[PDB]
Amino acid sequence: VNSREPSQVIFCNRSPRVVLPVWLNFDGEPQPYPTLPPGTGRRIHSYRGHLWLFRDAGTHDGLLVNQTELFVPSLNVDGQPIFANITLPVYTLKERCLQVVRSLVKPENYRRLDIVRSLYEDLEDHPNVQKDLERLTQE
Amino acid sequence: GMTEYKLVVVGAVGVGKSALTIQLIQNHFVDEYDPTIEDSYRKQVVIDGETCLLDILDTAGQEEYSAMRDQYMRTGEGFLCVFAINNTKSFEDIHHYREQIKRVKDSEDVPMVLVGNKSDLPSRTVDTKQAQDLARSYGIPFIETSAKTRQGVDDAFYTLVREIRKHKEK
Amino acid sequence: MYVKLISSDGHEFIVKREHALTSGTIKAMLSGPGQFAENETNEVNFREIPSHVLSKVCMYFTYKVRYTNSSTEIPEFPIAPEIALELLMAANFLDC
Amino acid sequence: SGAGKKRFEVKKWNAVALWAWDIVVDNCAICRNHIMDLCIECQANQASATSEECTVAWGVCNHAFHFHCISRWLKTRQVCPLDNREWE
Amino acid sequence: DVFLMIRRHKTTIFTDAKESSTVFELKRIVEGILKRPPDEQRLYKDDQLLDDGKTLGECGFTSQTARPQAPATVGLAFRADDTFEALCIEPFSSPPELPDVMK
Amino acid sequence: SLKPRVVDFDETWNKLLTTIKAVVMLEYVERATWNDRFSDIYALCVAYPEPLGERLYTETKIFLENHVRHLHKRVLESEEQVLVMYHRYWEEYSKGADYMDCLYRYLNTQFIKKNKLTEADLQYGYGGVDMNEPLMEIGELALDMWRKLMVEPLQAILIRMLLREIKNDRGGEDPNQKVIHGVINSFVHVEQYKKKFPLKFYQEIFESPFLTETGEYYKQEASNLLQESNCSQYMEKVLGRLKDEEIRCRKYLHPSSYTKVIHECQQRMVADHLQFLHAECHNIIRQEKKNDMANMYVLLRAVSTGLPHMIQELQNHIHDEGLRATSNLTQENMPTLFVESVLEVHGKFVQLINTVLNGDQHFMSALDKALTSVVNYREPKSVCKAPELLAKYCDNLLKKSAKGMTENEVEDRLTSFITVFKYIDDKDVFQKFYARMLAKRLIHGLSMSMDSEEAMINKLKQACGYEFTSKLHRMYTDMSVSADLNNKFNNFIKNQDTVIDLGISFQIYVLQAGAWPLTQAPSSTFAIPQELEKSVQMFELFYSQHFSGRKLTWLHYLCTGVTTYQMAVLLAFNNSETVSYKELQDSTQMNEKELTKTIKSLLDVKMINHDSEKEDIDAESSFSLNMNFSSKRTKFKITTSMQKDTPQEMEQTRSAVDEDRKMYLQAAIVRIMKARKVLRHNALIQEVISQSRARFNPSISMIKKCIEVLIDKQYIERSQASADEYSYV
Ligand SMILES: Nc1nc2c(ncn2[C@@H]2O[C@H](COP(=O)(O)OP(=O)(O)O)[C@@H](O)[C@H]2O)c(=O)[nH]1
Ligand SMILES: [Zn+2]
Ligand SMILES: [Zn+2]
Incomplete structure (x- = not known):
């Protein structure tokens, strides 16, 4: 929505991988933004009360900020800008290991691997932003 | 042909973007020019012994964000963020115009000159030191102008061209 | 307090019960038939889990227990490319 | 004398007295209350001055009048609420 | 919070300890699992044994080298029958040849 | 090497069937075999030629079908022991199903993925409702299959056995609680699907028959109690059954049905015989038996419509009791007994609302809305009762009262006086009546203390508010302030420029003219002896400029020093034989045409013919001796009287109240x-x-x-x- 913006946030990433943030506007269509180099920080403004989503630039993995998926700016307190720190989520082995396989395996060469039948669908299921925000509409 | 410079004049409504533009090209002061007209104007001038054409876009209208205006603004090689020394709100809005120029140009180093208009008026609310510090923080020159008396009007545009030239030799 | 894991080759691994309880299959195996605890809840035997993959799973369990809900930085878990397929199969089997 | 004395003596004398502002202003026009008490009229013009003495002061007509009761008078009417008008 | 790995023959132990802890405390903690008195048992750094007086900090390890992802390996030997035995590390099975993924 | 393999499925299932059968009905199974069966299930789901999940699920479903029917035959074969046999088999099956879910954990994950794909296609095509959608877990399937055993005609038998066995409240057979609770809890335990209502099955199969049976049983029980027990002992029976009902329902019924069963119990024995209870409602209130009144309130609290009936009855008793005490007090010419009667009724009944009624601010409303009518009676036309009596009560505790002295008690009594003040409606009458009575006190200075009445305005500060006490706050301030002006002139009289004594012994109580209710200047009069006012006139002119805005108007209404309108002695004689009007002469300029009888009557107690004294002759006087009393001497010649008498005069004050009442209208x-x-x-x-x-x-x-x-x-x-x-x- 259209509202005043008396707030600003800091985007600092602790994860080794490059971070590509996507921000939800009033329309709801996240847009690409320049990638943040690892171990850096940038001073940025923001709409008050608007969601922010942080994702990997390369393979679009999940990233957690303030132990939460969404980021909501708040009104400034006593002249102190609010700080947001990005950390790697605790991936499960099935999810973590698929990331290693996906990077190494050419996307048109899954069927040649000698694995179980069920894992073929999971391996081909590349992460997607529209899928990611679908599981956040509830609650 | 001879070198052309596409520069853009931006600022709050009523600071004098149209008056400065008309004064530079037509050499007379027009007061209460229609605030809704946004158009491009051309003039052939010589600065530092080099003749060039200035393509001056006098911006106006409502704030709006899309690809068409972003691309329209992206064509600009230099920018003039002009405020009124008797309008504190206009000076406070100067920072807002600067960021968007950086977004559309995708660079922190954009040729840009801070302009303080209406220097002939005695109701100044922004002191000179305040504007010089803001310009210094931006790494940009600051010029005080008066479209009524043409004081520093040519200086503001000529410096911006020099800023563009100094950017291009880098 | 400490569970015991045995691989196909014969290697024996001893890890904490809470560390090994993060896997649904191990939790189900421990919480199965009638419990006496005198010689129970121990020597959990995996017939088709090699020693290196079982060690990697134990390293997971330790790392996840230590780094849960932590405000500090979370370094990535390193997985060897040569063990990737077997580790993925073991993770799928154990329901990590 | 059966029970008495010469008397003809002077003793201390004490009593009560009533003070007034000496300018009634004919109870103004609509308040028709004592000039000492707070006027009902002062709730509209809202001229906060001399809270102790709401009405006892110089009037707008360069004559002794209520401070604010006659202030509204110039806004709406023209007659003089001091002369030739009683009760009503 | 260094994470160690005690391996004897085929038995493997996954425990954790602090740098302020000592080899005596490590022996105490492995005693409750191995059901063997701690006086006889001794630890190794693949080159020489560790004395009880020396603490965990001065013998190496440290948090940077000892991490949950790649915990350090500490040997252990039994000293019951009056004769020491060579450290039988017995390394794990070799991984198979990598599939078509080698590119 | 967890790679897919080839399985015949005709040997692993046979081995697995023996283990599964041992898991059910709680039979011993080897720990090593329990862990081994996990790998067999995984191997079947990843068979190389084609997945065998469908074959495994169908085979497991068939096994549960035959096992349930096997237990069904044994339960139905045995009669008179259905409840005990059902409980034993249910406990074994309940734990067996849970263990099977853990063993089939891997197969459950496959079902969830398969179900989600088909769940998104139900709108386009049912396909026979997704071919009887597989259960999300095998354990949930087992509970469904046990439900079909419940659906079997065992439902009619179990309900009949349960209702008959629970109906043993008439006797003391004491049926076993474990069998009752286990069977009843099985109705809700089998249903754990959150898509539907979890309690839907339990309510339909057991709650509806139980509620109807419970209501009918107590309908007969209520009738039998009336034919023997009187209304008083009927309450004792009601309390025991209601208390036992909660205990009985606690042990046997589900927690979700605690309130519903109690509500049905109350609606049968109560609210159906409400006419019988209301007959004795008037008798118990009139009687002093407070113990039985408690049982009235407990039963009637639950029923919404019953409380209003006892609201009116309690009000009537208060109204009649208050009138009897007030009416019998007439012609006693005593105002202090009216307040005592009202507070005694309030004090006695406020305890009853607490100790035997347990608060109930709704019932506390009856006390307030009934006592207010007692204060203002108005039916007898005598002394107006309520306005005057309340006003004439506070003065007795605030005047001198030399005979009646209760120090450190007037503060307590005056605080207790507020319990009747707010019950009156004619507060305007009391406000001005008290003001005139109060003003009479400070003028003559017969108040017993200066700080005593400070509590009175403070007590009226919050009850009446600042608007009511805006004037009454001015009475106190003036007397305190007047103690500053009198000594100010005393300091000023010693600092005269002329330095002349002027022979002045003067004191002044400055009034307000905005809040003082005493009348000023009834006529012209304004007659003052010349030899005295000359000093007083100096006081007026030398004090006004100190404020420079005030010109005090001298009055002689309450002059003293009582010596009102002094005769100034003079040197003339007159005659006085009988009555009055003896040709009064040498009267100066007072306006005393109609005030002769009021003023001339002052001296008849002392002097009549005005012919005594006149012995000594001197320039001023002799003052030879004093002998008897001198100066103020007797002082007993006052004519101000008590209560002002004159039964006509105070009628104007009440009319002035109406005139002031007309001002607010x-x-x-x-x-x-x-x-x-x-x-x-x-x-x-x-x-x-x-x-x-x-x-x-x-x-x-x-x-x-x-x-x-x-x-x-x-x-x-x-x-x-x-x-x-x-x-x-
Ligand atoms: N005194 C003075 N007034 C000015 C100057 N420039 C502009 N103005 C006044 O500002 C008003 C509006 O200026 P305008 O150029 O239309 O504002 P803009 O086009 O929105 O930037 C006009 O009525 C002018 O009188 C100046 O240099 N001196
Ligand atoms: Zn007035
Ligand atoms: Zn006023």
Whole structure:
């Protein structure tokens, strides 16, 4: 929505991988933004009360900020800008290991691997932003 | 042909973007020019012994964000963020115009000159030191102008061209 | 307090019960038939889990227990490319 | 004398007295209350001055009048609420 | 919070300890699992044994080298029958040849 | 190497069937075999030629079908022991199903993925409702199959056995609780699907038959109690059954049905025989048996409609009790006994509302709305009762009262006086009546202390508010302030420029003229002896300029020093034989034409013929000796009297109250029309009540008089008639 913006946030990433943030506007269509180099920080403004989503630039993995998926700016307190720190989520082995396989395996060469039948669908299921925000509409 | 410079004049409504533009090209002061007209104007001038054409876009209208205006603004090689020394709100809005120029140009180093208009008026609310510090923080020159008396009007545009030239030799 | 894991080759691994309880299959195996605890809840035997993959799973369990809900930085878990397929199969089997 | 004395003596004398502002202003026009008490009229013009003495002061007509009761008078009417008008 | 790995023959132990802890405390903690008195048992750094007086900090390890992802390996030997035995590390099975993924 | 393999499925299932059968019904199974079966299930789901999940699920479903029927035959074969046999088999099956879910954990994950794909296609095509959608877990399937055993005609038998066995409340057979609780809890335990209502099955199969049976049983029980027990002992029986019902329902029934079963119990024995209870309602209230009244309240609290009946009965008893004490007190000429009677009734009944009624502010309303009518009786036309008696009660505890002295008790008694003050409605009458009575005290200085009455205005500070006490706060300040002006002149008289004594012994109590209720200047009069006022005139001129805005008006209403309108002795003689009007002569300029009888009567107690004394002759006087009393001497010649007498004079004060009441009738409307420009016939009525109910009583009878005044002082014509036309503009 259209509202005043008396707030600003800091985007600092602790994860080794490059971070590509996507921000939800009033329309709801996240847009690409320049990638943040690892171990850096940038001073940025923001709409008050608007969601922010942080994702990997390369393979679009999940990233957690303030132990939460969404980021909501708040009104400034006593002249102190609010700080947001990005950390790697605790991936499960099935999810973590698929990331290693996906990077190494050419996307048109899954069927040649000698694995179980069920894992073929999971391996081909590349992460997607529209899928990611679908599981956040509830609650 | 001879070198052309596409520069853009931006600022709050009523600071004098149209008056400065008309004064530079037509050499007379027009007061209460229609605030809704946004158009491009051309003039052939010589600065530092080099003749060039200035393509001056006098911006106006409502704030709006899309690809068409972003691309329209992206064509600009230099920018003039002009405020009124008797309008504190206009000076406070100067920072807002600067960021968007950086977004559309995708660079922190954009040729840009801070302009303080209406220097002939005695109701100044922004002191000179305040504007010089803001310009210094931006790494940009600051010029005080008066479209009524043409004081520093040519200086503001000529410096911006020099800023563009100094950017291009880098 | 400490569970015991045995691989196909014969290697024996001893890890904490809470560390090994993060896997649904191990939790189900421990919480199965009638419990006496005198010689129970121990020597959990995996017939088709090699020693290196079982060690990697134990390293997971330790790392996840230590780094849960932590405000500090979370370094990535390193997985060897040569063990990737077997580790993925073991993770799928154990329901990590 | 059966029970008495010469008397003809002077003793201390004490009593009560009533003070007034000496300018009634004919109870103004609509308040028709004592000039000492707070006027009902002062709730509209809202001229906060001399809270102790709401009405006892110089009037707008360069004559002794209520401070604010006659202030509204110039806004709406023209007659003089001091002369030739009683009760009503 | 260094994470160690005690391996004897085929038995493997996954425990954790602090740098302020000592080899005596490590022996105490492995005693409750191995059901063997701690006086006889001794630890190794693949080159020489560790004395009880020396603490965990001065013998190496440290948090940077000892991490949950790649915990350090500490040997252990039994000293019951009056004769020491060579450290039988017995390394794990070799991984198979990598599939078509080698590119 | 977890790679897919080839399995015949005809050997692993046979081995797995033996283990699964041992898991059910709680049979011993080897720990090593339990872990081994996990790999067999995984191997079948990843078979290389084709997945065998469908084959495994169907085979497991068939096994549960035959096992349930096997237990069904054994339970149905045995009679008279269905409940005990059902409980034993249910416990084994309940734990066996849970263990099977853990063993089939891997297969459950495959079902979830398969179900989600088909769940998104139900709208386009049912396919026979997704071919009887596989259960999300195998354990949930087992509970469904046990439900079909419940659906079997065992449902009719189990309900019949349960209702008959629970119906043993008549006797003391004491059926076993574990069998009852286990069977009843099985109805809700089998249903754990969150898509539907979890309690839907339990309510339909057991709650409906139980509630109807419970109501019918207590319908007969209630009738049998009336034919033997009297209304008093009926309550004792009711309490015991209700208390035992909660205990009985606690052990046997689900927690979700605690309130419903109690509500049905109350609606049968109570609210169906309410006429019988209401017959004794009047008798118990009149009697002093407070113990039985508690049982009235406990039963009647649950029923919504029963409470209003006992609201009126309690009010009637209070109204009759208060009138009897007040009416019998008439002609006693004692105002201090009226307050005692009201507080005693309030004090006695406030305990009853607490100790044997347990609060109930709704019942506390009966005390307030009934006692207020007792104070203002108005039926007898004598001394007006309520307004005057309350006013004449506080003075007895605040005047001198030399004989009646209770120090450190007047503060307590005056605080207790507030329990009757707010129950009155004519507070305007009391306010001005007390003001005139109060003003009579400080003027003569017969108050027993200066700080004693400070509590009175403080007690009225919050009850009456600042608006009521705006004037009454001025009485206290003036007397305190007047103690500053008198000594100010004492300091000033010693600092005269002329330095002349002037022979002055003077004291002044400065009044307000805005709040003092005493009348000023009834006539012209203004006659003052010349030899005395000359000093007093110096006081007036040398004090006004100190304030420079005040010119005090001298009065002689309450002059003293009582020596009112002194004769100045002179040197003349007259005659006085009988009655009065003996040709009074040498009367100076006082306006005393009609005041002769009031003033001349002062001296007849002392002197009659004005012929005594006149012995000594001197320039001023002799003053040879004093002998007997001198100066103020007897002082017993006062004529101010007590209560002012004159049964006509105080009638004007009450009329002045009406005149002041008339002032608010045409002035309270100013605020009403200031906010509500558009007025409605119902809007004006009770609007004054909403803002001035405490001040006075805006009865509709006298409101009709106020609107008559509103007709005048207006010239705007009221064309419409939809609403009231008394609104201006
Ligand atoms: N005194 C003075 N007034 C100015 C100057 N420039 C502009 N103005 C006044 O500002 C008003 C509006 O300026 P305008 O150029 O239309 O504002 P803009 O086009 O929105 O930037 C006009 O009525 C002018 O009188 C100046 O240099 N001196
Ligand atoms: Zn007035
Ligand atoms: Zn006023």
